[PDB]
Design an enzyme around this catalytic site. Structure first.
Site, PDB file in Angstrom:
ATOM      1  N   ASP A 149       1.030  -1.331  -0.124  1.00 46.52           N
ATOM      2  CA  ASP A 149      -0.105   0.026   0.010  1.00 46.52           C
ATOM      3  C   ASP A 149       0.824   1.361  -0.111  1.00 46.52           C
ATOM      4  O   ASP A 149       1.298   1.684   0.937  1.00 46.52           O
ATOM      5  CB  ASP A 149      -0.733   0.085   1.465  1.00 46.52           C
ATOM      6  CG  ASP A 149      -1.874   1.042   0.962  1.00 46.52           C
ATOM      7  OD1 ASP A 149      -1.660   2.051   0.375  1.00 46.52           O
ATOM      8  OD2 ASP A 149      -3.007   0.990   1.865  1.00 46.52           O
ATOM      9  N   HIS A 154      -0.009   7.893   4.125  1.00 46.67           N
ATOM     10  CA  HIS A 154       0.646   7.299   4.976  1.00 46.67           C
ATOM     11  C   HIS A 154       2.235   8.071   5.372  1.00 46.67           C
ATOM     12  O   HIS A 154       2.844   7.396   5.976  1.00 46.67           O
ATOM     13  CB  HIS A 154       0.589   5.782   5.031  1.00 46.67           C
ATOM     14  CG  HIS A 154      -0.834   5.210   4.906  1.00 46.67           C
ATOM     15  ND1 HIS A 154      -1.559   5.480   5.969  1.00 46.67           N
ATOM     16  CD2 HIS A 154      -1.096   4.644   4.002  1.00 46.67           C
ATOM     17  CE1 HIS A 154      -2.704   4.839   5.559  1.00 46.67           C
ATOM     18  NE2 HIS A 154      -2.518   4.283   4.371  1.00 46.67           N
ATOM     19  N   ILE A 169      -0.713   9.257   8.588  1.00 52.61           N
ATOM     20  CA  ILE A 169      -1.481   8.279   9.539  1.00 52.61           C
ATOM     21  C   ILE A 169      -0.869   7.024   9.226  1.00 52.61           C
ATOM     22  O   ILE A 169      -0.411   6.500   7.894  1.00 52.61           O
ATOM     23  CB  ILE A 169      -2.837   8.143   9.610  1.00 52.61           C
ATOM     24  CG1 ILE A 169      -3.402   7.923   8.290  1.00 52.61           C
ATOM     25  CG2 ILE A 169      -3.264   9.619  10.197  1.00 52.61           C
ATOM     26  CD1 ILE A 169      -5.015   7.939   7.963  1.00 52.61           C
ATOM     27  N   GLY A 172      -4.350   1.365   8.121  1.00 56.82           N
ATOM     28  CA  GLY A 172      -5.256   0.633   9.235  1.00 56.82           C
ATOM     29  C   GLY A 172      -4.742  -0.798   9.257  1.00 56.82           C
ATOM     30  O   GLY A 172      -4.878  -1.349  10.424  1.00 56.82           O
TER      31      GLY A 172
END
Lengths: 245, 248
Positions: A149, A154, A169, A172
């Site tokens: 990903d 991110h 961030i 997940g």
């Protein structure tokens, strides 16, 4: 219910170990050598690595990863090639099942933001049976992204701000890997083979460097779990569980 | 076999392998300037100079005593390369030069000094005066576990057993990893992270480093040559000596 274009995935111990590291495994704990060293006679691929296998997959930028479900019909090999078939299963919110075969090995159900849904589950109404903490690295995202990903969300600061975040961030699915990895070692003795399935719902964000708090409840062969950020106490993963043998 | 050439091989990579190297060698997004080596999306994205050590290393993948790398051209953010190895000379020490080309063009030159001449890239003594600057780096307990993903899978750096049975208290960090660290620091301290100004580096390996220990890179600027030495702030042992890096 359109049946998307089939893709394939191949990996070696490398990609596996890379996932394990980016998901928390550390040689500080001898038992983790099992997921970090291919030379280990015990070498295994972490169960949630299957999320990466079926992860090869409208305005993608307007999409949110709501929930995730993974089931392992067979322990994931220390390496190998797999044929994957993605099929949209239902529908705003789109649930899409994706099966990965080798010779069926695993099934992923991405709830991107019905009866064909793998429902999340509420946690027991009683204090947790156990809760382990994990310290995220300032580069956790920088490493985990190497597993596929590459969303700038991110790692790119400006990209994250325009997206609305004080700073990039953590994925997940990375937090997910952490908690899942802990459940595996706490209630299944790192026995990859006993890891049957996991379901999780994503909530508040996690920032690289923060500290994860995985709360677990054992109810028979189902380990319910919730994940927080010891610092803000926010719940980042909710109504999750993992079925064992 | 003093001057014998070995079977030619090729190394191809993408930003991934590069970033993986950078991380395993110390780069951290804690420092915004490092985003340049960790994020392929960065408009500034560059591959770290010492990554060339990995390009010509694929040959080996005994003691690795010294290392020398010269970049005739900045390493691309990705690409395929053809490599040619050659036992430059033998001394027992064996010196093996390996040149890597990108079509008929020469990109980098590695000179691995393996332990067990007029054709050898000599190490150099550090200036006899206090260092101009010294930066510290904290190694991770998994530094070796990550760096090895870049090619050198020797068990010596991770399996507790092989470690001892070879004469080591516990697994040791790859010499080339400490190398990457110090070289990375020199690059940011005396060349503004300008990959293009990094011409060559020479280093001699000394005492071991254990994942988790803290590196101490001491630097002396002498014109366009930055001399450096690396220690382990904890034992004060010198792990890399008589090294330097030439800047343009």
């Amino acid at each position: 219910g359109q049946k998307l274009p089939p893709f394939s995935y191949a990996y070696t111990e490398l990609e596996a170990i890379m996932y394990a590291l980016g998901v928390g495994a550390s040689i500080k704990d001898p038992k983790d050598l099992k997921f970090i060293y291919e030379g280990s006679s015990d070498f295994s691929c972490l169960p949630t690595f299957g999320v990466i296998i079926g992860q090869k997959s409208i305005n993608f930028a307007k999409v949110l990863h709501g929930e995730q479900y993974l089931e392992l019909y067979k322990p994931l090999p220390r390496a190998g090639k797999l044929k994957c078939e993605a099929v949209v299963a239902d529908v705003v919110v789109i649930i899409m099942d994706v099966y990965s075969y080798s010779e069926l090995i695993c099934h992923n159900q991405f709830s991107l933001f019905s009866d064909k849904v793998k429902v999340a589950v509420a946690i027991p109404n009683r204090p947790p049976d156990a809760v382990l903490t994990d310290t995220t690295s300032l580069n956790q995202a920088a490493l985990y992204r190497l597993s596929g990903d590459w969303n700038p969300l991110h790692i790119d600061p400006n990209f994250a701000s325009l997206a609305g975040f004080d700073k990039p961030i953590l994925h997940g699915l990375c937090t997910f890997g952490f908690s899942a990895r802990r459940v595996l070692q706490q209630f299944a003795d790192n026995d990859v083979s006993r890891f049957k399935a996991v379901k999780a719902r994503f909530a508040k964000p996690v920032y690289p460097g923060q500290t994860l708090q995985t709360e677990m409840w054992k109810e028979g062969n189902r380990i319910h779990f919730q994940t927080k950020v010891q610092e803000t106490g926010d719940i980042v993963i909710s109504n999750a569980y993992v079925d064992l043998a």
